[PDB]
Amino acid sequence: AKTRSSRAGLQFPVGRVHRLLRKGNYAERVGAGAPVYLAAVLEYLTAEILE
DNA sequence: AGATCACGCGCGATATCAGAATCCCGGTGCCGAGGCCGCTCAATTGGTCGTAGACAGCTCTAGCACCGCTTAAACGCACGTACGCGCTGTCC
Numbered sequence: 001a002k003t004r005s006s007r008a009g010l011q012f013p014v015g016r017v018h019r020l021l022r023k024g025n026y027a028e029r030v031g032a033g034a035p036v037y038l039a040a041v042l043e044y045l046t047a048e049i050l051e
Numbered sequence: 052a053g054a055t056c057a058c059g060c061g062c063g064a065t066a067t068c069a070g071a072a073t074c075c076c077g078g079t080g081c082c083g084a085g086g087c088c089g090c091t092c093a094a095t096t097g098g099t100c101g102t103a104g105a106c107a108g109c110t111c112t113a114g115c116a117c118c119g120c121t122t123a124a125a126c127g128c129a130c131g132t133a134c135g136c137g138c139t140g141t142c143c
Contacts, residue, residue: 003095004094015095016094018094019093
């Protein structure tokens with residue numbers, strides 16, 4: 001699978017989250033797992049609200 | 052004078068006579084949502100290099116702990132007064 005969400009088994013965009021973390025002036029560098037973790041958390045909260 | 056029965060008055064509950072507002076059921080037209088299509092930009096793949104972070108060794112500062120005194124502060128008790136709370140009436 002190409003998309004990083006598919007690798008992480010998520011419906012939210014890991015690539016977009018990584019890009020925002022980088023172009024958000026949050027830190028000099030952004031780990032590889034931070035976008036995955038944040039996408040998973042956002043997906044969980046979205047599902048929790050939508051249920 | 053006391054007890055029982057009948058009648059009258061007062062209070063509570065149900066019904067009701069109504070009528071008022073809400074919810075519901077149906078038909079209807081709509082526009083807002085879901086979906087398909089095409090295009091392209093942003094994400095992915097591959098590779099590099101460099102520094103940020105991980106790890107080990109050492110240092111010594113600060114946290115923990117312990118003891119013992121002394122004494123400020125908490126705890127306890129009691130009297131009472133004044134504040135909380137309930138009841139009531141009036142006016143707006």
